[PDB]
């Protein structure tokens, strides 16, 4: 026959290799594909879907649907903080179980921008303002409404917009989000309960991941 030499690496099984192998049943005619709605080609297609963020994940709230409901006290102290959190999708307890957070926990390294949507769920006739502020990585977090106001922010008037959307320029494997009570919430009538805010998160732009790992959630 044809002269050959076996080289190092011969007769060994690399669990990560890619070689052809014989078919156990070569005579079997395999069932044809049919279109099925919802084909997924990439996991980023999932990471880009908004999911509800458990911002109010405090003891006693984590076991309920209430974890997702940020309370708004209509008669709270003016200038007080409504809510806030460390902006870290792969570590913070607020973001690491969201659809985005789950996908990123399969990778050692990742980066991109994220989108945060805040939705007000008070009555139709409720009005008032919130200050949504962003603190760049390493800047710490505002301690007062004025400090937050002097940084980068948006004034969210719920009487005009039921929701407000932020896109963080940088999210990587930190920064902060805070919301302050610029005004109280003004209503036409005396209600039974408070108002809630829901928060949603998704990938904003082309988001990248690099090396696959076991999820830390088993």
């Amino acid at each position: 026959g044809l002269p050959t030499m076996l080289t190092p690496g011969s007769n060994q099984f690399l669990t990560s290799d890619d070689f052809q192998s014989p078919s156990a049943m070569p005579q079997f005619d395999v069932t044809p594909e049919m279109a099925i709605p919802g084909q997924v080609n990439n996991l980023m297609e999932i990471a880009e879907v908004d999911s509800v963020v458990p911002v109010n994940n405090t003891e006693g709230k984590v076991m309920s649907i209430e974890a997702y409901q940020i309370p708004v006290q209509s008669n709270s102290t003016n200038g007080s903080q409504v809510f806030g959190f460390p902006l870290i999708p792969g570590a913070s307890s607020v973001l690491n179980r969201t659809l985005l957070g789950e996908i990123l926990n399969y990778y050692t390294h990742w980066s991109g921008s994220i989108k945060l949507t805040f939705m007000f769920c008070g009555s139709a006739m409720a009005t008032g303002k919130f200050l949504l502020a962003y603190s760049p990585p390493g800047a710490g977090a505002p301690t007062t409404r004025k400090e937050a106001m002097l940084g980068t922010h948006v004034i969210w008037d719920v009487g005009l917009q039921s929701s407000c959307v932020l896109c963080i320029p940088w999210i990587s494997q930190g920064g902060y989000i805070t919301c302050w009570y610029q005004t109280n919430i003004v209503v036409p009538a005396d209600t039974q309960s408070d108002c809630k805010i829901l928060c949603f998160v998704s990938a904003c732009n082309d988001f990248s991941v690099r090396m696959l790992k076991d999820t830390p959630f088993i």
């Binding site: 049919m34 999911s51 649907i65 179980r97 008070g122 009555s123 409720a126 209600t191 039974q192 809630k196």
Partner: protein
């Protein structure tokens, strides 16, 4: 501004500005002879449910939800094999003095867990036909009961991630309705409608209902269903 929609011998009213969600971007279409049936393409309105400040949520399994519904329900028994898509219209009756927010989501193959780990849930606990099942706020306990604690959507997932499935939000502040178009989704082109539920409709509050003093203490939620492109196995000689 207001649109009148008539199918067969039934009419409903919707708003012209209402949005429509088409699940997976796919409209229902037509597909061993098979016979189509358009005699069932009418609106079937389910008994409404009342949304209270403490309601945990509701669900329906679809092929089963319409099993007693006139002719659609009859075709399920005369034919053994078939398929259909659905349009689901969900509407709330609320004033401007009411607040709250619902997630209206349709979940394919929504296999549900049992309250007892060693067992499987019974058929009635999984579906009560046209009558809605109710999610719990607490852990469910029973031997054949569905684990209905709403936090896990009865599936062992976090409820906040149900948005991956075709859905629409109803924020009473901005809208009182949702429309979802659900294409047929399965591993096979036609199946036995009494041994499998293609999808489950879940309505889950994320922001509790509340209102001004003197306002009505509850909000009615109505679910109206219109089958499309229904097809069944032929019943004649070749």
């Amino acid at each position: 501004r207001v649109r009148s929609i008539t199918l067969g011998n039934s009419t409903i009213t919707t708003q012209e500005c209402a949005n429509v969600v088409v699940g997976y971007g796919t409209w229902p279409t037509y597909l061993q002879p098979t016979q189509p049936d358009v005699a069932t393409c009418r609106f079937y309105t389910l008994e409404s449910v009342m949304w209270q400040q403490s309601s945990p949520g509701w669900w329906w399994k679809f092929p089963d939800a319409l099993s007693n519904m006139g002719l659609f329900g009859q075709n399920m028994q005369y034919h053994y094999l078939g398929r259909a898509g659905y349009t689901l219209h969900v509407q709330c009756n609320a004033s401007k003095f009411h607040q709250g927010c619902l997630l209206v989501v349709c979940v394919p193959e929504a296999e549900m867990g049992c309250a007892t780990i060693a067992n499987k849930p019974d058929q009635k606990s999984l579906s009560n036909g046209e009558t809605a099942n109710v999610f719990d706020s607490q852990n469910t306990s029973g031997q054949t009961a569905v684990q209905a604690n709403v936090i896990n959507a009865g599936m062992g997932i976090g409820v906040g991630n149900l948005t991956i499935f075709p859905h629409q939000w109803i924020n009473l502040r901005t809208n009182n309705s949702a429309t979802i178009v659900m294409p047929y989704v399965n591993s096979v082109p036609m199946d036995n409608m009494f041994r499998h539920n293609n999808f489950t409709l879940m309505i889950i509050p994320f922001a509790p209902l509340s209102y001004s003093t003197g306002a009505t203490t509850y909000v009615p939620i109505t679910v109206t269903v219109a089958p499309m492109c229904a097809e069944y196995n032929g019943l004649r000689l070749a």
